[PDB]
């Protein structure tokens, strides 16, 4: 019961199942295409603080995947490495054949800890995590992915690092990592470009920790 789009010299139509269109010729299987599109193209927020609120954990439901033949370049991809407070892993290792998404502009790598209630992390809106040419219902550990959806039809990076605490819950906190001992408090009003600009002025000017302590920066509210 999965719909197919049909591309005409008019517009994009959705193929029926009850109505047979005699002129909708299919000459080969090469005219059928699976396309992975990103959610960012619909205006969903992409900052880390808001993104992680769309994900959550559950048990009793197995993971599954489907393939793509083509897809979009992502401006914002994510890569998670989350551990439980006791040091154990939250996310499963990716299985053979799963590789990261090939075309990301900024990768938001989040490392940290938090409660992990289930077996797997699932998307709450039912969107898929997009891996190289495979969409998945779950997040795999250490693998870069984009969020998105898959269409079927008839045809005729800069790496930004963050630390996280309380990753799997509602009230969580994040830091932007400049150096091993240098961090900036993260806010939802920051864009990837903003963070890169802060990394250049702080690092270049030497406003970094010299002692063994952690230097934590807070952006002026204005």
């Amino acid at each position, epitope marked *: 019961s999965i719909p197919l789009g049909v591309i005409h010299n008019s517009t994009l139509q959705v193929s029926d199942v009850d109505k047979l269109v005699c002129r909708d010729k299919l000459s080969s299987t090469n005219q059928l295409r699976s396309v992975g599109l990103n959610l960012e193209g619909n205006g969903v927020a992409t900052d880390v603080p808001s993104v992680t609120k769309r994900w959550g954990f559950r048990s009793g439901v197995p993971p599954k995947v489907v393939n793509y033949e083509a897809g979009e370049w992502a401006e914002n991809c994510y890569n998670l490495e989350i551990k439980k407070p006791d040091g154990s892993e939250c996310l499963p290792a990716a299985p053979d054949g799963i590789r990261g998404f090939p075309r990301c502009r900024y990768v938001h790598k989040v490392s940290g800890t938090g409660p992990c209630a289930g077996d797997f992390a699932f998307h709450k809106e039912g969107a898929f995590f997009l891996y190289d040419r495979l969409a998945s219902t779950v997040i795999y550990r250490g693998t870069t992915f984009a969020e998105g959806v898959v269409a079927f039809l008839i045809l005729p990076s800069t790496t930004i690092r963050y630390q996280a605490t309380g990753f799997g819950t509602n009230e969580t906190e994040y830091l932007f990592e400049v150096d091993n001992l240098t961090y900036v408090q993260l806010e939802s009003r920051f864009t990837p470009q903003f963070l890169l600009q802060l990394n250049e002025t702080i690092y270049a000017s030497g406003k970094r920790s010299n002692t063994t302590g952690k230097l*934590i920066w807070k952006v002026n509210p204005e």
Partner: nanobody, 136 residues
């Protein structure tokens, strides 16, 4: 700029227990983006003794204890209330001491960008010390 002040002391009988507290201000909150906090005690006539310290949540939130208090004292924090606590069980009269809270903090360099603080693995800020007396 950081200050922390101890309370919850006074006279307790041996074989009992008590919980000390230390509430501060001048920092950026003591739970996240902050130094962990320790307890140190000093009996009159004696030097300081490390009890243990609670790490910040960004550093895991665990407690590292000194051997002399293992399995008797617990170091914990009231998150976002900027308050450090010490639960001392199985009290003996040997535990009479002044109990101090201590913090690896203080303000760092500023920039046109924003403000900053440093969180250390040593102590810059000491509280006043609350005397705990354990006696019959």
């Amino acid at each position: 700029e950081v200050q922390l002040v101890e309370s919850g002391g006074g006279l307790v009988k041996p074989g009992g227990s008590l919980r000390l507290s230390c509430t501060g201000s001048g920092g950026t909150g003591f739970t996240f983006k902050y130094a962990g906090m320790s307890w140190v005690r000093q009996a009159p006539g004696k030097g300081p003794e490390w009890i243990g310290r609670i790490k910040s949540r960004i550093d895991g939130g665990t407690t590292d204890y000194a051997a002399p208090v293992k399995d008797r004292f617990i170091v914990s924090r009231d998150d976002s209330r900027n308050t450090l606590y010490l639960q001392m069980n199985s009290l003996k009269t040997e535990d009479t001491a002044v109990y101090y809270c201590a913090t690896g903090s203080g303000k760092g360099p500023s920039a046109s960008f924003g403000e900053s603080y440093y969180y250390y693995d040593f102590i810059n800020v000491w509280g006043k010390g609350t005397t705990v007396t354990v006696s019959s």
